[PDB]
Design a protein around this nucleic acid. Structure first.
Length: 87
RNA sequence: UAGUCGCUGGGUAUAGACCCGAAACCGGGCGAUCUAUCCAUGAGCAGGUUGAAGGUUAGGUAACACUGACUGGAGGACCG
């Protein structure tokens, strides 16, 4: 998984009436942080496709959570596409 | 019951043995200023084409891919 220090760290800018861990600030961008740091083990273990099928499972679900923000909230979408180093 | 040693011729033997004439064989040298390779040290290859590997960049991807563009200037390469 992610680091025990980190998975409780990254929520500190996702707060937005802080008790939310459910809006797509969290399941995009905890999950975007899952994308950006678990690249490491692939370089050593390139013969195990079980771990990047989870990557494509949630980067679609991130894009699915981008897809609902296409219509529900375009303005807070700019906080996602403008930030995080996307695209 | 006649032979011997000359001398002059005719033959013969051994010597190049009437004269001329092989290809070749062997022994000592001479020669790689030609040529065949090699060794050292020098230098010659007008001009025009082609556009390999590498780079850079954009684009694309989990980084690897992978496609453009620009650059690059390879070759018992091409034309002369």
């Amino acid at each position: 998984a992610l680091s025990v220090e980190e998975k409780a760290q990254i929520v500190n800018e996702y707060k937005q009436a802080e008790g939310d861990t459910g809006s797509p600030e969290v399941q995009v961008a905890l999950l975007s942080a899952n994308i950006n740091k678990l690249q490491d083990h692939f370089k050593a273990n390139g013969k195990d496709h079980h771990s990047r099928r989870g990557l494509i499972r949630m980067v679609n679900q991130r894009r699915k959570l981008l897809d609902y923000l296409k219509g529900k909230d375009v303005s807070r979408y700019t906080a996602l596409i403008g930030r995080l180093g996307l695209r």
